[PDB]
Amino acid sequence: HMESADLRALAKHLYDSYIKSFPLTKAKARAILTGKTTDKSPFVIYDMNSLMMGEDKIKSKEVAIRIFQGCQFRSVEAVQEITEYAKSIPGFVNLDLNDQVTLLKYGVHEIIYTMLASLMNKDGVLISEGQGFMTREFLKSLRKPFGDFMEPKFEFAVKFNALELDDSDLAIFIAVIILSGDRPGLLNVKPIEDIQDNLLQALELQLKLNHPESSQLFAKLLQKMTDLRQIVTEHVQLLQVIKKTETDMSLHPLLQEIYKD
Amino acid sequence: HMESADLRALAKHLYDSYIKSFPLTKAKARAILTGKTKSPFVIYDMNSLMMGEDKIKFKHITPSKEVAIRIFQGCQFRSVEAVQEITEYAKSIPGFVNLDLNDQVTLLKYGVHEIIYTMLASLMNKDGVLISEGQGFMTREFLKSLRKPFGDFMEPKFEFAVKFNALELDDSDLAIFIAVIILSGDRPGLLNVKPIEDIQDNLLQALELQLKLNHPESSQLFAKLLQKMTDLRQIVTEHVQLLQVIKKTETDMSLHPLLQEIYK
Ligand SMILES: O=C(O)c1ccc(-c2nn(C(=O)c3ccccc3C(F)(F)F)c3ccc(Cl)cc23)c(OCc2ccccc2)c1
Numbered sequence: 001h002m003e004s005a006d007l008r009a010l011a012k013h014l015y016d017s018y019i020k021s022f023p024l025t026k027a028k029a030r031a032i033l034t035g036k037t038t039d040k041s042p043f044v045i046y047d048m049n050s051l052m053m054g055e056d057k058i059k060s061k062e063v064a065i066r067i068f069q070g071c072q073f074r075s076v077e078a079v080q081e082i083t084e085y086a087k088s089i090p091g092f093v094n095l096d097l098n099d100q101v102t103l104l105k106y107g108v109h110e111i112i113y114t115m116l117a118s119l120m121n122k123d124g125v126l127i128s129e130g131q132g133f134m135t136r137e138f139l140k141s142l143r144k145p146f147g148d149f150m151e152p153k154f155e156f157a158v159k160f161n162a163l164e165l166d167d168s169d170l171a172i173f174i175a176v177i178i179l180s181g182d183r184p185g186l187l188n189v190k191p192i193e194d195i196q197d198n199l200l201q202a203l204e205l206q207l208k209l210n211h212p213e214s215s216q217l218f219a220k221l222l223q224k225m226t227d228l229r230q231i232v233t234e235h236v237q238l239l240q241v242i243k244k245t246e247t248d249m250s251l252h253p254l255l256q257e258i259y260k261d
Numbered sequence: 262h263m264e265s266a267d268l269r270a271l272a273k274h275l276y277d278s279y280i281k282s283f284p285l286t287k288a289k290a291r292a293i294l295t296g297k298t299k300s301p302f303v304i305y306d307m308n309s310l311m312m313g314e315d316k317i318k319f320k321h322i323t324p325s326k327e328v329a330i331r332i333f334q335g336c337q338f339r340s341v342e343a344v345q346e347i348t349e350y351a352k353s354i355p356g357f358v359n360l361d362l363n364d365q366v367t368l369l370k371y372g373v374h375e376i377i378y379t380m381l382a383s384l385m386n387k388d389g390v391l392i393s394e395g396q397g398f399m400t401r402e403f404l405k406s407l408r409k410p411f412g413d414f415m416e417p418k419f420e421f422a423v424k425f426n427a428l429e430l431d432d433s434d435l436a437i438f439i440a441v442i443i444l445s446g447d448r449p450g451l452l453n454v455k456p457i458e459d460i461q462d463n464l465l466q467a468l469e470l471q472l473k474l475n476h477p478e479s480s481q482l483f484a485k486l487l488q489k490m491t492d493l494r495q496i497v498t499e500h501v502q503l504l505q506v507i508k509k510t511e512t513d514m515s516l517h518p519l520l521q522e523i524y525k
Pocket residue numbers: 067068070071072073074075078109112115116119125126127128134139149150153239255
């Protein structure tokens with residue numbers, strides 16, 4: 001149990017670190033997506049030629065592969081940003097070193113999908129630090145397994161975004177996910193759960209103060225961690241199929257390790 | 262939104278109905294498992310299984326001849342019994358019977374599996390599970406040692422139960438929790454989601470207050486119990502994938518077609 005002023009202090013700490021760690025916030029993404037601004041307008045990729053024009057403006061292989069490799073390159077960057085953020089979560093670096101590895105191993109994907117929703121609306125997703133926007137339709141029409149590889153992200157995002165969280169909410173939610181004591185292979189569950197209890201208290205107070213008319217938002221947000229657990233599973237099963245079919249591509253060493261078991 | 266006295270009224274309402282709907286409560290089951298009370302008959306191997314059906318005559322072992330199949334089918338037979346008990350309980354949740362009739366059916370269809378696993382934990386400890394309204398006790402070791410896929414079909418249930426039971430919920434806690442599961446607005450095919458989520462919001466409010474009053478020392482128990490709704494969704498999917506494997510491999514499973522229809 002923490003005092004009210006201590007919970008607000010933890011929320012501000014985490015929001016501050018989130019701003020330092022993630023270059024494209026939800027606030028910035030929404031300003032780009034909503035428009036009515038001549039300086040922040042993205043170039044829109046909706047087909048083959050506009051993709052070709054994109055490389056010239058935004059700055060040898062098949063289209064679906066090229067786009068897929070684009071996603072994994074950005075996923076690796078996301079893993080790096082998430083790792084930097086976790087180090088700022090009070091108590092995280094003081095945990096057993098193997099458990100730090102374990103928490104990140106299973107946590108990064110759930111966080112990537114969460115923060116990907118910030119860059120999405122029902123029609124597409126921001127790319128290249130918000131300079132680009134690739135339509136849902138174009139992703140959904142890619143060949144082989146790749147077309148159906150993109151769409152479930154959009155389905156989750158539309159539902160997650162209906163909660164209308166802002167970055168200060170997401171900062172605490174992301175921290176709660178990382179500090180999950182039910183990850184397989186953890187050596188000391190108790191010190192992880194004590195941290196998550198504090199983060200859960202801080203999230204609960206944050207949501208009540210920042211969304212006072214949004215009844216049981218806390219409970220509804222925790223119920224979304226079920227949708228996250230499922231999509232990660234679908235994702236892993238789709239990567240496995242691609243590995244056994246495209247024995248052309250290679251994953252980044254960082255990603256390879258995360259998916260080993 | 263809701264006044265404190267109305268939430269306690271709702272909690273009391275659901276507890277009373279939960280006692281009427283489910284014959285073997287967690288309070289009663291714990292008395293049997295601990296040894297704090299007519300000892301149950303213990304099934305720990307093949308020969309004691311034979312004596313149990315001869316003496317007690319457990320209703321889910323009757324006319325396949327192989328033991329592991331017979332026990333597996335016995336689990337399905339009890340599950341169908343539980344579905345009717347859950348259906349009756351759901352009728353007492355304020356607002357449920359006023360929902361669209363198709364949505365009532367859809368909520369029960371997709372919810373009963375999560376509730377069956379939830380309530381199965383009440384009957385379990387690290388060593389085994391009560392059966393036949395508590396008259397019997399089937400050891401974990403005997404279940405885990407069943408051949409081919411059947412052994413590995415039983416053990417995940419025990420693994421969930423042990424972790425779920427560490428929360429130390431009682432029946433008044435569980436009555437509201439079960440109601441929350443039923444009123445899930447994300448079930449596929451729902452026609453009118455808004456009144457379902459409106460009810461679930463009231464039940465979540467009642468659950469939160471119930472837990473703070475009944476477990477004041479248990480920090481963020483509300484959050485932790487909602488996190489178990491993640492495990493449940495995961496265990497149910499695993500379960501379904503395991504039935505499919507048995508169907509496509511085991512051709513000693515067929516029952517009378519009328520039975521097959523009952524247990525579809
Ligand atoms: O900016 C960000 O924070 C950000 C974060 C994640 C993705 C993203 N990852 N991802 C994966 O499949 C994935 C996820 C986790 C771990 C590994 C992977 C991996 F290896 F299998 F690739 C996606 C699939 C579909 C869609 Cl629409 C987006 C993604 C992202 O993609 C923007 C994008 C779209 C088109 C061309 C280029 C870039 C952007």
